[PDB]
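Notes continue from the previous slide.

Worked example: a multi-chain complex. Inputs as given:
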Amino acid sequence: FEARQRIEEKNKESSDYHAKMAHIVNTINTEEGAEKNKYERERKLR
Amino acid sequence: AVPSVQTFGKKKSATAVAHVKAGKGLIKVNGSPITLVEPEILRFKVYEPLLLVGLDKFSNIDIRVRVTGGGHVSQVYAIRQAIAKGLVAYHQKYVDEQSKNELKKAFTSYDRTLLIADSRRPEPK
Amino acid sequence: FDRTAKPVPVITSEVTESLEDMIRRRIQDSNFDDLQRRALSEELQKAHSEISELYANLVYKLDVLSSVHFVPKPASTSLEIRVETPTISMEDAQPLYMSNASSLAPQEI
Amino acid sequence: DDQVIGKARSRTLEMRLNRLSRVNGHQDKINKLEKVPMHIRRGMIDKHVK
Amino acid sequence: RAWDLIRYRNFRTFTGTERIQFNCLAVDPSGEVVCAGSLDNFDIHVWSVQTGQLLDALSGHEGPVSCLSFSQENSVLASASWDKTIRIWSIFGRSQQVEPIE
Amino acid sequence: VRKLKHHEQKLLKKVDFLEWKQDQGHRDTQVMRTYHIQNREDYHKYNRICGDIRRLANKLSLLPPTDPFRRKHEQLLLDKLYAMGVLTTKSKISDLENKVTVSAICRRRLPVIMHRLKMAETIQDAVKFIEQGHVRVGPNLINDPAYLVTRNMEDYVTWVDNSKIKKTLLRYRNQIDDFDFS
Amino acid sequence: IKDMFSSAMEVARFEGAQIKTVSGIRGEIKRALSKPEGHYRAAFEDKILMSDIVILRSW
Amino acid sequence: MLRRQARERREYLYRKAQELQDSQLQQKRQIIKQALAQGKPLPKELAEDESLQKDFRYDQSLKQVDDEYAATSGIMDPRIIVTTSRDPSTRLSQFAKEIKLLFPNAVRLNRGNYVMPNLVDACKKSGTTDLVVLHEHRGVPTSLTISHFPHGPTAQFSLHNVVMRHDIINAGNQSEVNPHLIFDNFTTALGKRVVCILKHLFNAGPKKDSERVITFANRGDFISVRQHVYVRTREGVEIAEVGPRFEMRLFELRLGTLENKDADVEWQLRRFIRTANKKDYL
């Protein structure tokens, strides 16, 4: 019984951790590569 | 330069190679004579290829049989099948064909498992 | 401590009743995963006729090359009619005959 | 198409494949001319221009 | 295929589901059953003559069924094939019995 | 013929006494050398048949891509050549034009089937062995090397019984049973 | 496996755990043995050697 | 037929390797088919090669069960041999009886002194299709191995929560009519392969009013097998539990019969990987 409970709580924990870190990596990539490409788009017109 | 004829007999996992060549009349199984084949109540199973057709067939050839595998009764059955088809094959090759198929008629009328083993089994009912 | 695999699930009344009404829904909706028992154009009709003739000649010489061990074509439930005629007239030319019935049966008449 | 019989079919397909292929493929390699000798390709061109 | 020599007609055509080429056939005495054996299939195809269907396919040879015959008295099927084996099938009457002879 | 000097080689450029244009690069000679074909017209009698298959696949590809006459006849021809062994696989229909070939029909011969079945050491020795009359397919002996051995019928290429070659491989593995003649 | 437990009750308490040797060969406790008290059967990735030490990391 | 079945295996796995090899041609042929469908440009690798286009003229007229069962999927009903391990106990012989009642067209064979090589040879030359080998542990049946015979696949399962129709009560006889089947959430490709394995050993095409159902319900890699009879009443369906119930777990699927154990494995249960207990149908 404790086998099944511990394995399922572990898998829930790890599948939440992957979601959280992929979320913050993708928002840092998207909404700041927007600003990096915006600045290089306003540095190639200088 | 000498006539020689090799045949094989087989039962369940026994095997018996018989070499028949033109000789003095001596029949040997595993180096010992044919009269020392155990378990001695199946010695007449070994003896019946000889006595079915008479010892005058054997009086000029000399057979030797190497037997391997199986148990006691598998070994005596492979020995008798090797003796039978070895004598028939020697008579086909170096003696006349009339005597060859007279020997075939004698062994087949006694039991054709002296010449053809039951090879592939079973049946899916 | 950590454990290797999830243990074999114990079979309680809750999982038997969830299994059973899964079957009840499938069996009243008749959703079963069973096995299942198994005019054109003038230019197009003449193109078809040309490659029909070509395919028949080619199959003939492939069979006489293959020394007629081959594998046959599948099947065609065709439809052939037969007129009602004496089997004297359905024979070969010789002085005799072999049967004098008619080529259609009483029930076919 | 589903109604175009032989030679118009093969050349319609060849025409379409060349036209779709010319966008991304190299200009040196999409239109390969047939290896025709000099004195008869010049002759073909002269009579065709006539 | 069956030929009636009275109206000169082909009244039955028996085919297998496999499209193989048959090289020997044998008919029952009371022509209920026609069997035929190929040189590339190892089975013996048994069709009924009244209903045209394939009644069964007898398997058990491990070589091409070279020749077939039906015994004209007790109606047993003797087949014989290139696996050095003749083989006697009691087909009719609840038995379905096979007897191999090497 | 005398390894022409330079002005001669410039003045007569098309002269060649061995390789002509109608020879097509001596492929009759070259694939009959590869597969050890005995008589001279077997390449071209196979080439007529490759021409017929490729003509039919051409005319049969010229039909519209959807119609069932085209699809059915391409599949019939494809299964026919695969079961005859001329094709290697019935995957795509461009095998009917690309990969049907006199060398394919020749690889399906009997000495080549012998060699690929390891029943001889080379195609010349397979030709010698079946000219010498050792090889049967099924029950009956085959004597000419041109015999074409289809996919079902290459399970029956054996030697004849009483052949000295069958005797010597059985007695190499000293399994020779002199009861049944070999 | 010989002695990391003292009895079949302890092995029953620790069935199904993941163990490993010092050579990284993973494995798992399968069943408490019957005849010696603290011994058990474990199934590993491949054939471990007699010179190894199995290991159950716990907290 | 030994030579013929050997080279038929040889040719089939040659064709298998060829298709996985040149199945890039299938997809770039599909690419230029859809590019002629919607008139969009062709990528550079396909635009520069003249061979695939003049082969596309021929290949334009090209275009569900899997490779082992395809030749006779719905045509011929199966023939199934059910056998036990060796010197079986009495509850294992009762279980083999119950399994041959589970599958129609299944006979039961007595096992003893049957080498599994010549049992495979005898089976596949007397023309059966499936072989179900049962393994016990002091009465309790622990494994079953399903073998499809024209050099097909063997799926080995272990059975877990076994209750038997003998061991309940004297409840009567079974139905033995051709049953319907229920296959629940076999979602992955291995689940579909196992669905094909498991359902091609029932007779094809049951009746629409056939009153016997037998369900394989995947619940976390544990295929729960139950068997039922029913009668459709005026408000719902009343389900009655006939026949044995268990849970089978697939632990191996290889691509030959039982006799070799040199077959190329399609899927065997990776038990001691680091991510062993995270995914299903792993």
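Summary box: The radius of gyration of chain E is 13 Å. Chain E touches chain H at residues 17, 42-43, 57, 59-60, 62-63, 83 (CB under 8 Å).
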